[PDB]
């Protein structure tokens, strides 16, 4: 209940309800939906709370800007219940607030100004996009300010908006098609490029949509023929074949400032005629194989995009697409499989030539007899289909695999000379891990060579000198299974194959006079002696001339200075981790003993420079 | 070069930033003239002393040293050379290339506009190149053309970080189709750098920060499951800077070959040792990529795993004043303070929580003859200026669902109040009935301070904490503030006596006793290698002593978290308790806590369980002293 202006618990309840409304407006929940609040004073306080608190505050409580208030009207769903329960009963607006009614007045003034620019077409088109994406709320606020036609007006403004959008899209596609050829030619876009560079905060009547029917717009085209040029470029800009024809036609023209309406017959009409010529060739399929591998050279291994590209060619001449596309897709695909079979048969003859497996295959003779044959017809080569049955799924991948056996003849020569079977590899690997370096490239040469020869062990160890096609393919199948767990196997074969000098000198290596940094760290951590003296010569007391390391080993010894131990520490921090923790504890012991010795050198020099005479002769 | 055939082998000195050594007061390039003649100072000319020489530079040089050699210089690529470089990137696939060929000219003009409009040289060529690489990658992945969402993400990842540059304004002023309207948060851009979905590798991150608070956010929000290995400038005393640089490069190298993230809080000490790794220029061997890491004069190729990401977290002011312009141009800047990640309803919860904390603290009770006004820093220990944005972000991350509901909003508010009440002193909870919050809320806050929370002792807190079911957590990090004494060693034996069925002999480390980081790690690994499930670590610093054990805390926390993430197995659970001892005489107020991230803040006033008194001061609060002496 209420107890008037002096009842303080009602003032506390009103302040708490204002805080609850502000909390339900900082969250985007609805405050008033089904609130039977028949006492009009407290319902007026609720409405004043939702107006004052749901208002779009930014750095200041009022908004002196129309468009954010109009977005507030369109978006926030308590605004329509607000205007409904404000207008349907005239006894509620009388007790809101001075400030709440100021904000209500600003709300109806903003809605009246913006939606008053809407009967006439004077609306800024951004607000038109706003009202079209906010239809139902706008219709309800329009009804509440009309009761105090619309839908046909909204459909009319909607269709004029869609027309403006597709005309801007056509001009965009035209600009980009003529912008792909900026380093070939250049075209002057009348005044369309400055109009198209404008933002769309422009009024809608500035798009000139008048009659006396036909919708002329501020992209004033020099003819409707240029407009249909733009429409058919926009329908064919996503076709790669048309982009090829466009580029070669723009190259066929050759500081050339070209006007726009001569581009249409200089560059667009012959390109479109050649494009429709290729379309009508592909209709009945009388195109030659020469034009097939001259045009579709980018469409190998990719046949969903060629499906979409032929649909884009079919949308040019508007008829059906039932049996035209798929037959030609399969036909070009089969020609691609025949040519990959040609390249595969050439590299497989190269690999039986370089590998030394003579045997006899007697199966790929006409498929190489056809590589010198040149025929010009668009028909399905049927006798090659069974030939393709022995080169079905080799791939345009995996063919580098065979090709990497084909180029590395010196590698397989050395591997047959110096390995002779699979089981010597495991001593050679273990003999190479000693002879390789300590860093991360040098160690991984051994694992490259190991993985490469165990991947190609199906061929470079076990192939008999005379074989038919059958066992050759039946062990290439095992090669492809040994490939499908390591795709970088041709890389490992070529990388070990260019490491044959090191791979030869694995077993002919002498005793290398070199201290690996781990071995030197173990020698320092087991028999090394640190010495601090402050030298007796005329030298300074820098930390590089105070500390020494003496390493006894034939009873000579080696003296390491501070910078040589720092160099060792750097080499030791950056070497390849051998995945064992005895190495980790030797590196960590050397690091910590050197850190503590260097801290001792530091305190010793501080005592020396302080002038102490006790540590003057200390060692 | 000595002792080798000089017709089949050559050694080349490469000086990498000779423009910086140019007008240096030590004048090092003055040595460069007699060294390019014969490679020796005060010595006779010889074989194997004349070496090759390449000097690369970004700042200009004078040709009075470069009359000795051939000098190549370029000013800036112009617009057709930018389009040629974009086509040179996109040349690996011609279908995608003439799909996205329409965008090479507006991107080039927009990049030239950005390069004019920016004040300090901030955005460079690698930003444009990475724009072309991201656009090419997305158009290969979709095979649909380019959505305006793809263009706005590629622009807004590759041109960000600078505040007085509107990147989308410039790049969509040129082309008017990609006016993407719904907003793109820095959260999701940073996340799609850190976690990509499979030479198309992005740059690393430079997260620019106000007041170091970004690592707190990345730990609360992004770091799913695998914590990265924070590589940091250790503040233990008597640590040698050189060996710490060496060990930091060793940890970067191990994380590179493993495939785990690093977070660099000190790039300025490590930039000379990492500059070739940040350039993303690999060499290959068997499908393995190898990048050059260096220490001193020792550069070696180290293995980079295919899923290795790097984040440099750095202050925005330090990036703008320090950080050489070539280093900024490699690192994909994004800014992340706290106003970034807090949606505006969460900022309203921050404001409401600050008012609630001032009403919790401000009590009106002059029934005792005194005069003292209570800050919320006196009441909530660890409270500071920010301190509620931290609390709200912790509460939101505790919720999970994160759709604004008014049923979510209420529990973010109440979880934030629970987080604040968990660091309040019990005498303030007694004073709470004389506060503006009302006796009813004062009563329910006392109820869920003495019955829902566990502030009694450290062993009561452990017994209710070890029995919790911490989901998807292998380690639990809790910071504890106390006014009672630190645990001594007899207290550790008593504590392990009570935790016999739950814990595994908690190991109490005292932070004042560690000079070096290595000895601290020796004790942390000593604790970690002992067998047991639910092993407990307790690290102790008293701030009110002559020890400076107040800046060792972050180093100890980072060190323990890194060693736990790289050393803990799969069976055991780990419980870390940093205990900090403060005083009523001033250090409890000057203390800055509510360290978010992965640390939960708790104030336990008396760490020891008391035999004398009841462990609920409400039951002492309804009786009077004479009723304390009533017999049976």
From Swiss-Prot, chain B:
This is E3 ubiquitin-protein ligase RNF213. Atypical E3 ubiquitin ligase that can catalyze ubiquitination of both proteins and lipids, and which is involved in various processes, such as lipid metabolism, angiogenesis and cell-autonomous immunity. Acts as a key immune sensor by catalyzing ubiquitination of the lipid A moiety of bacterial lipopolysaccharide (LPS) via its RZ-type zinc-finger: restricts the proliferation of cytosolic bacteria, such as Salmonella, by generating the bacterial ubiquitin coat through the ubiquitination of LPS. It is found in: Cytoplasm, Cytosol; Lipid droplet. Disruption phenotype: No visible phenotype. Males and female are fertile and produce normal-sized litters. Mice do not spontaneously develop Moyamoya disease, a chronic occlusive cerebrovascular disease. Mice are however more susceptible to Rift Valley fever virus infection. Mice show elevated expression of MMP9. Monomer. Interacts with UBE2L3/UBCH7; UBE2L3/UBCH7 is the most efficient ubiquitin-conjugating enzyme E2 for the ubiquitin ligase activity. Interacts with UBE2N/UBC13; promoting 'Lys-63'-linked ubiquitination of target proteins. Belongs to the AAA ATPase family. It comes from Mus musculus. Composed of an N-terminal stalk, a dynein-like core comprised of two catalytically active and four inactive ATPase domains, and a C-terminal E3 module. The ATPase regions do not generate movement but rather act like an intricate molecular 'switch'. The chain holds residues 2790 to 3429 of 5148 of the full protein. The lineage of its organism: Eukaryota, Metazoa, Chordata, Craniata, Vertebrata.
């Amino acid at each position: 209940r209420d107890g008037g202006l002096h009842d303080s618990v009602s003032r506390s309840f009103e302040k708490c309800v204002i805080e609850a409304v502000s909390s339900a407006c900082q969250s985007q929940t609805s405050v008033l939906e089904g609130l039977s609040c028949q006492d009009l004073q407290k319902f007026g306080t609720l409405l004043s709370a939702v107006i004052t608190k749901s208002w779009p505050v930014h750095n200041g409580e009022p908004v002196f800007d129309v468009d954010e208030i109009f977005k507030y009207l369109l978006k926030w769903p308590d605004v329509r219940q607000l205007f409904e329960l404000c207008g349907t009963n005239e006894k509620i607006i009388d007790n809101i607030t001075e400030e709440g009614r100021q904000l209500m007045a600003t709300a109806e003034s903003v809605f009246q100004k913006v939606a008053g620019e809407l009967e006439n077409g004077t609306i800024v088109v951004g607000q038109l996009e706003l009202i079209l994406e906010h239809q139902s709320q706008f219709l309800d606020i329009w009804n509440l300010n009309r009761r105090r036609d619309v839908r046909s007006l909204l459909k009319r403004r909607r269709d004029d908006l869609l027309f403006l959008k597709q005309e801007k899209r056509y001009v965009e596609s035209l600009l980009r098609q003529l912008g792909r050829v900026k380093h070939l030619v250049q075209v002057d876009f009348g005044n369309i490029e400055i109009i198209h560079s404008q933002d769309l905060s422009n009024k809608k009547l500035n798009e000139a949509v008048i009659k006396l029917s036909y919708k002329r717009e501020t992209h004033y085209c020099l003819s409707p023929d240029i407009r249909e040029m733009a429409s058919k470029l926009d329908s064919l800009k996503d076709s790669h074949i048309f982009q090829d024809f466009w580029q070669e036609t723009a190259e066929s023209l050759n500081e050339l400032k070209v006007s726009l309406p001569e581009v249409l017959e200089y560059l667009y009409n012959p390109c479109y005629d050649n494009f429709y010529t290729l379309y009508e060739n592909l209709k009945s399929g009388k195109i030659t194989f020469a034009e097939v591998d001259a045009i579709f050279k980018d469409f190998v291994d990719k046949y969903d995009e060629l499906k979409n590209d032929l649909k884009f060619m079919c949308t040019m001449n508007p008829q059906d697409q039932k049996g035209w596309i798929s037959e030609r897709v399969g036909q070009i695909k089969e020609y691609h499989t025949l040519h990959q079979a040609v390249s595969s048969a050439k590299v497989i003859l190269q690999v039986r030539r370089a590998l030394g497996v003579t045997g006899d295959f007697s199966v790929l003779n006409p498929l190489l007899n056809f590589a010198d044959s040149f025929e010009d017809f668009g028909n399905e080569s049927p006798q090659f289909i069974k030939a393709k049955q022995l080169l079905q799924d080799i791939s345009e991948p995996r063919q580098r695999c065979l090709e990497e056996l084909a180029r590395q003849t010196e590698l397989v020569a050395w591997l047959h000379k110096a390995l002779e079977d699979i089981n010597e590899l495991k001593v050679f690997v273990d003999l190479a891990s000693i002879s390789a370096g300590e860093n991360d490239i040098d160690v991984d040469r051994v694992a490259c060579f190991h993985d490469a020869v165990q991947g190609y062990a199906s061929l470079l160890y076990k192939m008999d000198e005379r074989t038919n096609f059958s066992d050759f393919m039946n062990h290439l199948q095992e090669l492809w299974r040994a490939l499908d767990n390591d795709q970088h196997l041709p890389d490992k074969l070529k990388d070990s194959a260019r490491n044959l000098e090191w791979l030869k000198t694995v077993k002919e290596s002498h005793g290398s006079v070199e201290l690996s940094s781990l071995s030197l760290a173990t020698a320092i951590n087991s028999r090394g002696v640190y010495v601090i003296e402050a030298p007796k010569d005329g030298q300074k007391i820098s930390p590089d001339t105070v500390l020494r390391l003496l390493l006894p080993d034939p009873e000579a010894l080696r003296t390491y200075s501070t910078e040589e131990l720092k160099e060792l520490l750097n080499k030791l921090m950056l070497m390849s981790g051998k995945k064992d923790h005895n190495s980790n504890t030797e590196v960590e012991k050397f690091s910590e003993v050197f850190s503590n010795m260097q801290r001792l050198v530091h305190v010793f020099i501080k005592l020396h420079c302080a002038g102490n005479m006790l540590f003057r002769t200390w060692t | 070069q000595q002792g080798k055939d000089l017709g089949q082998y050559v050694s080349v000195v490469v000086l990498d930033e000779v423009g910086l050594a140019e007008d240096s007061p030590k004048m090092p390039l003055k040595t460069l003239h007699p060294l390019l003649e014969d490679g020796c100072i005060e010595d006779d000319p010889a074989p194997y002393k004349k070496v090759g020489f390449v000097g690369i530079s970004n700042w200009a040089l004078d040709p009075a040293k470069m009359n000795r050699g051939i000098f190549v210089s370029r000013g800036s690529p112009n617009e057709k050379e930018l389009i040629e470089s974009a086509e040179g990137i996109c040349s690996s696939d011609r279908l995608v290339q003439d799909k996205i060929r329409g965008y090479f000219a507006p991107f080039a003009k927009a990049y030239e506009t950005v390069c004019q409009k920016q004040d300090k040289e901030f955005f460079g060529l690698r930003d444009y190149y990475s724009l072309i690489k991201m656009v090419f990658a997305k158009a290969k992945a979709s095979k649909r053309g380019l959505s305006p969402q793809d263009i706005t993400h590629a622009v807004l990842r590759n041109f960000s970080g600078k505040d007085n540059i509107q990147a989308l304004s410039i790049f969509t002023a040129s082309l008017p189709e990609a006016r993407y309207k719904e907003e793109v948060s820095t959260v999701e851009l940073i996340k799609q750098n850190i976690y990509p979905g499979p030479g198309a590798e992005s740059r690393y991150l430079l997260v620019l920060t106000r007041n170091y608070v970004a690592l707190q956010i990345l730990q609360q929000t992004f770091f799913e499951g695998q914590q990265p290995e924070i590589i940091f400038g250790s503040s233990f005393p008597q640590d040698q800077e050189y060996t710490q640089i060496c060990r930091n490069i060793n940890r970067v190298k191990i994380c590179m070959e493993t495939g785990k993230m690093v977070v660099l809080l000190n790039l300025q000490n490590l930039y000379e040792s990492l500059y070739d790794a940040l350039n993303q220029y690999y060499v290959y061997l068997g499908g393995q990529k190898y990048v050059d890491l260096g220490l001193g004069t020792h550069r070696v190729k180290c293995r980079v795993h295919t899923a290795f990401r790097l984040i440099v977290i750095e202050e925005k002011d330090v990036v703008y004043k320090q950080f050489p312009v070539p280093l900024i141009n490699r690192l994909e800047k994004h800014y992340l303070d706290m106003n970034t990640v807090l949606q505006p309803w969460q900022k309203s919860i921050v404001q409401e929580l600050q008012q609630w904390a001032h009403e919790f603290a401000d009590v009106k009770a002059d029934q005792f003859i005194a005069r003292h006004k209570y800050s919320p820093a006196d009441v909530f220990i660890g409270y500071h200026s920010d301190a509620c944005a931290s609390v709200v972000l912790q509460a939101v991350e505790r919720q999970g669902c994160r759709d604004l509901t008014e049923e979510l909003y209420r529990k973010v508010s109440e979880e934030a109040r629970s987080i604040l009440l968990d660091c309040a002193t019990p005498d303030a909870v007694v004073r709470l009935s004389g506060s503006s919050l009302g006796s009813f809320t004062a009563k329910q806050l006392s109820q869920e301070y003495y019955y829902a929370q566990q502030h009694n002792s450290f062993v009561d807190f452990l017994q209710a904490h070890l029995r919790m079911t911490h989901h998807e957590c292998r380690a639990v990090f809790t910071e504890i503030t106390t006014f009672s004494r630190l645990l001594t060693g007899n207290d550790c034996d008593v504590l392990a006596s009570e935790l016999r069925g739950l814990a595994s002999k908690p190991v109490v480390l005292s932070l004042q006793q560690y000079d070096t980081e290595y000895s601290f790690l020796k004790d942390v690994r000593s604790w970690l290698t002992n067998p047991g499930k639910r092993k407990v670590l307790v690290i102790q610093a008293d701030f009110d002593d002559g020890t400076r054990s107040a800046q060792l805390v972050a180093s100890a926390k980072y060190t323990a978290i890194n060693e736990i993430n790289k050393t803990q197995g799969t069976k055991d659970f780990v419980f870390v308790y940093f205990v900090t001892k403060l005083s009523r005489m001033g250090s409890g107020t000057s203390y800055v806590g509510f360290h978010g991230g992965l640390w939960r803040s708790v104030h336990i006033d008396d760490l020891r369980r008391s035999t004398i008194m009841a462990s609920d001061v409400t039951k002492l609060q309804n009786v009077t002293i004479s009723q304390l002496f009533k017999p049976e």
